[PDB]
């Protein structure tokens, strides 16, 4: 769904 590198609220 969402690229992990775009998510600032979850640790990749």
């Amino acid at each position, epitope marked *: 769904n969402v690229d992990p590198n*775009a*998510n*600032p*609220n979850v*640790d*990749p």
Partner: antibody, heavy 122, light 109 residues
Framework: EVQLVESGGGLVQPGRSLRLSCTASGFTFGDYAMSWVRQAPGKGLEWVGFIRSKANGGRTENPASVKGRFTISRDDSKSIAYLQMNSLKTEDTAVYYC?????????????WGQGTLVTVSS | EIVLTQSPGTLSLSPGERATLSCRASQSVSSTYLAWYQQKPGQAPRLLIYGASSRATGIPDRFSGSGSGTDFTLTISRLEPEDFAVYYCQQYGSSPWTFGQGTKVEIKR
């Protein structure tokens, strides 16, 4: 209420370095991701990177335009976010805004500082 | 990178009219990852709408958003004098986060 104050801007020559500070108050700084956005004179907004909260690893992401030159860091004991700007070019001339990244599934930039002007010129 | 194209570049309207601002994305973006910002002359940007349709704290009722996929809309039901400003859309669902080039709402004459 939330307050974000950028500092450290000013006149700098190409190839040199600057460190911007973003002093935060009115919220639990360490709980939030922080992000820098810049606006060149007369132009639009450009994302310059974010840093996650310590609880989410505290690592950073940057666009290609500043990759390898700009580094975001944070000092949670002081509630300050930093932007280390190396190898500066004239194209880096801009007002630099510090922003708080909202919690949850929709991480917009909920609060902005007044910005600090960085002028790169010889 | 997802390019956000805002149109029109300049919106010429009278106070009290309705403003409809468009933001078209080169790629499909979930509404969850789109936001709108307002920049008044001489001021820093401020958050208006996020998640395509959800209002930020303290933003008046006349601002609303809609859309999904590639075509998004910001609606100002009635323009107040302070609403004449620049508006940016932003997507944060893919890296790099990107902003549109901005739409200016100016007084028509």
């Amino acid at each position: 209420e939330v307050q974000l104050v950028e500092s450290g801007g000013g006149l700098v020559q190409p190839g040199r370095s600057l460190r911007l500070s973003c002093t935060a108050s009115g919220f639990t700084f360490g709980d939030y991701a922080m992000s820098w956005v810049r606006q060149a004179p007369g132009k639009g907004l450009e994302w310059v990177g974010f840093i996650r909260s310590k609880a989410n690893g505290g690592r950073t992401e940057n666009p290609a335009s500043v990759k390898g030159r700009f580094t975001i860091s944070r000092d949670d004991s002081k509630s300050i976010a930093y932007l280390q700007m190396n190898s500066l070019k004239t194209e880096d001339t801009a007002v630099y805004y510090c922003t708080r990244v909202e919690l949850g599934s929709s991480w917009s930039l909920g609060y902005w500082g007044q910005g600090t002007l960085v002028t790169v010129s010889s | 990178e997802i390019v956000l194209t805002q149109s029109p570049g300049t919106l010429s309207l009278s106070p009290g009219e309705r403003a409809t601002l468009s933001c078209r994305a080169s790629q499909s973006v979930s509404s969850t990852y789109l936001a709108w910002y307002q920049q008044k002359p001489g001021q820093a940007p401020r958050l208006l709408i996020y998640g395509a349709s959800s209002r930020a704290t303290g933003i008046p009722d006349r601002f609303s958003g809609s859309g999904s996929g590639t075509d998004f809309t910001l609606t100002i039901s009635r323009l107040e004098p302070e609403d004449f400003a620049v508006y940016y859309c932003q997507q944060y669902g893919s890296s790099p986060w990107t902003f549109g080039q901005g739409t200016k709402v100016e007084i028509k004459r």
